[PDB]
Structure 1
Amino acid sequence: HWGYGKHNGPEHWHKDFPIAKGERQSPVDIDTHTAKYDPSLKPLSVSYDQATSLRILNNGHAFNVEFDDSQDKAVLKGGPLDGTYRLIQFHFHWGSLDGQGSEHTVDKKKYAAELHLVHWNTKYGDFGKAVQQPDGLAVLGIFLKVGSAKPGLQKVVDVLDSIKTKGKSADFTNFDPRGLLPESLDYWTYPGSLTTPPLLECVTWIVLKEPISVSSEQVLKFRKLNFNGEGEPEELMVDNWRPAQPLKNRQIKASFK
């Protein structure tokens, strides 16, 4: 009923999910000429040393690398956040062409892809309760450009053939998400939403300023995934991004001058 196809893409989502036209929808364009430095912010605290990855799953829309979130193992704190947010999963959005694929844009520039590290606020006890709260989630967004290979992404690339089609999963233990980060943790932040249905307005977005680079071969392997299930007509999993939504009555704040 929803996807990224010719007849069920983002422009249709509002019919089943009216909040698609809401006040706090994501992604947005980040205008670097109007986002204002905020001294009230802190540095991010990203604590992934004890992360326990479990599995990788093709959900028909993207693939999720899932983590054990039953203890404080991989957490995000600081920045704009109060309290402790636990990593549940990460996934990507990417294009069919190197000049599109990201959800956020920067001065209207689209990146080749965007990584979302999804975390939920432990005060709400589980993910499903968290998404019902305005401060339920914190998503760390990281842009990808094509250039040099990202070594810490290669284990993901090499498992993709095992999860080509919707509903496939594979063991994915002992993956270190620190290998997906850029050098700098400078960021922009604003209040927004999930970027897929149900489009809930439960997210504190933290979008890193510095992109990571991935190789053309790495991206090409992402583009071989399938939206479809096994034994169905092949539909390449590409262009699984929602475009920028109106900022409305929001301000984007920068952690950096």
Structure 2
Amino acid sequence: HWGYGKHNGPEHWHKDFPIAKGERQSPVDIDTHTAKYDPSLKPLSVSYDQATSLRILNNGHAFNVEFDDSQDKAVLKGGPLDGTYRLIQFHFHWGSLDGQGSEHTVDKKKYAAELHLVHWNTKYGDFGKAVQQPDGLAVLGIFLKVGSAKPGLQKVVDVLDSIKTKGKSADFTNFDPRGLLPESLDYWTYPGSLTTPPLLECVTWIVLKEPISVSSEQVLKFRKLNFNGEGEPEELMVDNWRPAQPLKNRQIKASFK
């Protein structure tokens, strides 16, 4: 079963998930000199004031903070999107070292980690229906670089020892995801896929240009999580990132000049 290891990592996924070699796979390298400014792109509308986080889960691949998505509470609109997309979860991808960890790259630059805020298009009624549609999901990607601490990340950092191993969950209410955003909402956008199996080609990717800075201690505590379940051989949850995939017949558009 798939993972990031020696024997089951991204280069093996195509054997059980042949769409891994598909036409709109993610992540990709963002070539900043080839991305076209598109003045028809709208500013992003991030409406997280009424977000309801519920819990945090170690699923053996990353840790997900889950939200209540049964009403329009925390929604993403505007930008390249038609309609309203509801936040359902966020999670991160990170490295064993500060020099790697992000999934998207910028002119081949790898960031220390990458945050994915996952939203589904309300016109499809639920997340499981939305992932079967080419405009089903919108994922907001935010790079993390190692620098000053991110105060709004620390509640996430401090709960991690309670979900160290696969299958552990903890209550995680009243978390405000606005504390994870950078100052600017300038972005690049392209059509793509889930970056983990089943790798479905259902995502409008929106990747912010401005990274957030987190402290070395904050990202070190990500690296203390375990891919394995309790009682299984300990394997540190690091380098849970898929490398850049071929861009093929896609254009990356920039919301800014």
Question: TM exceeds 0.5?
Answer: yes
Unaligned runs of 5+ in 2: none
CA distance in 2, matches of 1:149, 1:245: 31
3-state SS, counterpart of residue 156 of structure 1: helix
Q: Shift in Å at residue 241 of structure 1?
A: 0.1
Q: Shift in Å at residue 116 of structure 1?
A: 0.1
Give the fraction of aligned pairs with identical amino acids, expressed as a percent. Answer: 100
* Residue-by-residue CA offset, 1:100-128 (whole Å, 9 max, x unaligned): 00000000000000000000000000000
CA distance in 2, matches of 1:93, 1:86: 21
CA distance in 1, matches of 2:183, 2:220: 24
Q: How does 1:2-151 map to 2 (within 5 A)?
A: 2-151=2-151
CA distance in 1, matches of 2:54, 2:18: 34
CA distance in 1, matches of 2:57, 2:20: 26
Q: Shift in Å at residue 61 of structure 1?
A: 0.2
Q: Shift in Å at residue 83 of structure 1?
A: 0.3
Q: Shift in Å at residue 151 of structure 1?
A: 0.2
**TM-score (norm. length: structure 2):** 1.00
Q: Shift in Å at residue 67 of structure 1?
A: 0.1
Q: Shift in Å at residue 62 of structure 1?
A: 0.1
* Residue-by-residue CA offset, 1:31-51 (whole Å, 9 max, x unaligned): 000001001100000000000
Q: Shift in Å at residue 180 of structure 1?
A: 0.1
Detail structure 1 runs of 4+ shifted over 4 Å in the superposition: none
3-state SS, counterpart of residue 83 of structure 1: coil
Match in the other structure for 1:241: 241
3-state SS, counterpart of residue 116 of structure 2: strand
CA distance in 1, matches of 2:28, 2:222: 24
Q: Shift in Å at residue 145 of structure 1?
A: 0.3
CA distance in 2, matches of 1:245, 1:40: 27
3-state SS, counterpart of residue 89 of structure 2: strand
CA distance in 1, matches of 2:2, 2:218: 27
CA distance in 1, matches of 2:222, 2:81: 32
CA distance in 1, matches of 2:70, 2:59: 22
CA distance in 2, matches of 1:28, 1:223: 24
* Residue-by-residue CA offset, 1:117-172 (whole Å, 9 max, x unaligned): 00000000000000000000000000000000000000000000000000000000
3-state SS, counterpart of residue 132 of structure 1: coil
CA distance in 1, matches of 2:219, 2:86: 28
Unaligned runs of 5+ in 1: none
Q: Shift in Å at residue 23 of structure 1?
A: 0.1
**TM-score (norm. length: structure 1):** 1.00
CA distance in 1, matches of 2:63, 2:98: 19
